[PDB]
Amino acid sequence: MLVLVIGDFHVPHRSAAIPQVFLDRLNTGRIQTVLCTGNLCGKETYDILRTLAREVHVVKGAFDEMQGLNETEVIKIGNFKIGLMHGHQVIPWGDREALAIYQRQLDVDILITGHTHKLETKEVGGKYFLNPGSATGAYSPLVDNPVPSFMLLEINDSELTIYEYTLVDGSVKCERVDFN
Structure with missing residues (x-):
């Protein structure tokens, strides 16, 4: 099961485009599922997501x-129950305890949220909290210099692997995080 974790495409009155490199990479993958945090540019974004994987959320x-x-x-x-929400609702924003409360509320092993516009992979108390950042590196009051980012998850039962993709200084960077 390969899951594309993406989101935070658009901010009202601010134009942002998904980097072509991300699109070229995403277009060929055998991505089974797409988990999107929200904030779509419009119908165009949804159309693009539908092309990438059979199942889009x-x-x-x-x-x-x-x-x-x-x-x-x-x-x-x-073996993972995944919780997905935009994350603007989590107050205070991005707080570990607030997110933990939501994770417990949803009763899920993995909680995926956006809002912050900063990609982050964190494991707390045996639970996993994932944020793919903004796909287009869109403006955020929270971050001074957001960069385009997304995540790819390789899940085999209880084995979880996170591929953190970011576009920094015109060059793509990827980091692998392994969890069992």
Whole structure:
């Protein structure tokens, strides 16, 4: 099971484009599932996501207006129950304890959130908290210099691998995080 974790595409009145390199890479992968944190540019973004994987999941973002978008979603992949939400609702923002409360609320092994516009992989108390950052490196009050980012998860049962992709200084960088 290969899962593309992406989100935070658009900010109102600010134009952002997904880097072509990310698109070229994403277009050929055998990506089974897409978990999107929300904040889509519009229908164009959804069309793109539909091309990447058979199964696409999108939660409601701060600026999302698409009808039928749930605030939270829970998907089971391998041995992991995955919780997904935009993360603007987690107050205080990005706080470990606040996120922990939501993870417990959703009763999931993995909690995926965006909002911060900073990609982060963290394991706390045997639970995993993942943020893929902004795919387009969109403006955020929270971060001075956001960079385009996304995550690819390789899950085989209880084995979790995170591929953190970021575009820094015009050159793509990738880091691998292993969890058992």
